[PDB]
Amino acid sequence: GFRPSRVVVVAKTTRYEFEQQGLLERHHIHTKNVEHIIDSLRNEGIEVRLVKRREYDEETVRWADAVIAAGGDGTMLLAASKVLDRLKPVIGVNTDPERSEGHLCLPVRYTHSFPEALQKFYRGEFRWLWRQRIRLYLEGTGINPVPVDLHEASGPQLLPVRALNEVFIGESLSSRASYYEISVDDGPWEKQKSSGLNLCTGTGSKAWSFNINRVATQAVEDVLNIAKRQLPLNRELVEKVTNEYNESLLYSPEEPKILFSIREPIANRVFSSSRQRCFSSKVCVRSRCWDACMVVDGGTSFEFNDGAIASMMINKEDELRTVLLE
């Protein structure tokens, strides 16, 4: 079984609010789905607190026996940003299924049919899913560990956020390429040059790390012609090879490997570079950057310039307690 007696809900802040604080149809809907959620809860003898960005403090989180994101994977990532305890269930409801993807949120039937999931909880007609998350240690010189809420010679210190999707590292200016020395599973330092790095979990293996590494159905077409050029096949086969490739880009969130990737490295005779991607347990990056940041779930940011040393790994006491319905 499972039913909590205290719940905080953290609702995204629709563009119609973003301004006030076809964009009305947007807001009326998100409202008409927060409403259906809170009223389904209160119909089950459940004290609920409803909050937005700055209200949603960890004090709220401690109070509640579970946490609901009423929004999208952002709002998931948001709520899942302020949760360190691997026992606290974090739950998201896709509040806008024509706009919000909601890959971290429940099946979309449960949006307007919410008491149904709730029943499935009291009865346990579900599963528990502990998604691994990435934690980050910052050492080096001149470092600056104060996080930055993007949504408006020292030692190793634990930064106050766990990365559920990925950690992004690169120059702030999107056009100034990035320089840093990197070490994987405690290997020798290799000076890469790229437009950044991306160290996802299996949760975020579908996220940003997918759209980097994935290939074109065309780039597949090309390479295959070129192969019999340098038993043929057709349109249908192109996709029954292309996806089997791109499948090998995703892994199970429970798997505790980090999938790091070089984001557009730089070839040539003065910038000899390593691999594109591979899995690991632990990475370590020495910023040789002038004005870069460390960017977690596209939501929190740390100053990561020269002499700073960030080192990412997975720890079990970070796995995120989430659920799972048929």
Ligand X SMILES: NC(=O)c1ccc[n+]([C@@H]2O[C@H](COP(=O)([O-])OP(=O)(O)OC[C@H]3O[C@@H](n4cnc5c(N)ncnc54)[C@H](OP(=O)(O)O)[C@@H]3O)[C@@H](O)[C@H]2O)c1
Please give the residue ranges that form the binding site for ligand X (CB under 6 A): 72-74, 77, 100-104, 165-166, 175, 177, 194-195, 203-204, 206-208, 211, 264, 266, 297-298
Of the two residues 140 and 170, which places its CB atom closer to a copy of itself in the complex?
170
CA distance to 75, 161, 182, per residue, from 13 (Å)? 9, 21, 38
Residue 97's SS3 state is coil
By the criterion CB under 8 A, which residues form the site for a copy of itself? 98-101, 150, 168, 170-176, 194-196, 208, 210-216, 218-220, 222-224, 226-227, 229-231, 233, 237, 240-242, 244-245, 248, 264-271, 275-276, 293, 295, 298, 301
In whole angstroms, the minimum distance from the beta carbon of 161 to ligand X comes to 12
User: Which residue of the chain is nearest ligand X when measured via CB?
Assistant: 74
Beta-sheet pairing, 144-149 with 300-303: antiparallel
**Residue 203 interacts with which of a copy of itself, ligand X, Mg ion, none, CB < 5 to 8 Å by class:** ligand X
Backbone angles phi, psi at 24, to 5 degrees: -85, -45
Q: Which residues pair with 148 in a beta bridge?
A: 301
By CB under 5 A, is residue 204 in contact with Mg ion? no
What is the Cα–Cα distance from 317 to 219, expressed in whole angstroms?
Answer: 41
**Residue 77 interacts with which of a copy of itself, Mg ion, ligand X, none, CB < 5 to 8 Å by class:** ligand X
Q: Where are the alpha helices (DSSP H) in the chain?
A: 15-20, 23-42, 58-63, 73-81, 109-112, 114-122, 208-213, 217-229, 235-247
**Residue 158 interacts with which of Mg ion, a copy of itself, ligand X, none, CB < 5 to 8 Å by class:** none
What is the Cα–Cα distance from 273 to 190, expressed in whole angstroms?
Answer: 8
In whole angstroms, the minimum distance from the beta carbon of 77 to a copy of itself comes to 11
In whole angstroms, the minimum distance from the beta carbon of 271 to a copy of itself comes to 8
Residue 208's SS3 state is helix
In whole angstroms, the minimum distance from the beta carbon of 193 to a copy of itself comes to 9
Of the two residues 46 and 302, which places its CB atom closer to ligand X in the complex?
302
Q: Where are the alpha helices (DSSP H) in 177-251?
A: 208-213, 217-229, 235-247
**Residue 204 interacts with which of a copy of itself, Mg ion, ligand X, none, CB < 5 to 8 Å by class:** ligand X
Determine contact, residues 311/282, Cβ cutoff 8 Å: yes
User: For residue 75, which of 42, 47, 52, 107 has the smallest C-alpha distance?
Assistant: 52
In whole angstroms, the minimum distance from the beta carbon of 208 to a copy of itself comes to 7
In whole angstroms, the minimum distance from the beta carbon of 240 to ligand X comes to 23
For the segment 62-101, give every residue that binds Mg ion (CB under 5 A).
Answer: 72, 74
In whole angstroms, the minimum distance from the beta carbon of 10 to a copy of itself comes to 20
